[PDB]
Symmetry: C3
Subunit: 36 residues, 3 copies
């Protein structure tokens, strides 16, 4: 359980970093529409 | 504390899954505007 | 390690709350375009 929890937390942190980049990518496309 | 930490990690993982789906839903609406 | 894990989990939870607010902010701008 302890080692499984360490790995689950690292996976959740990784997923948050990937979601922040996806949000930046969608913001870029939104801004092109807003200022087009 | 240990059992509280397990539950807090599961809640954070759940929230990440719900945020990924919300991002997909916003991407779908953005793509309809971008290709309309 | 245990105390470092507690702090890493709190940081991940904080990041999720900030990403939810960023998603709401992008949704607001998207909705203005969709209903403009
Ligand atoms: Pb987390
Ligand atoms: Zn703008
Ligand atoms: Zn597109
Ligand atoms: Zn709408």
């Amino acid at each position: 359980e302890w080692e499984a929890l360490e790995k689950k937390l690292a996976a959740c942190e990784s997923k948050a970093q990937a979601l922040e980049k996806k949000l930046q990518a969608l913001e870029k496309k939104l801004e092109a529409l807003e200022h087009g």
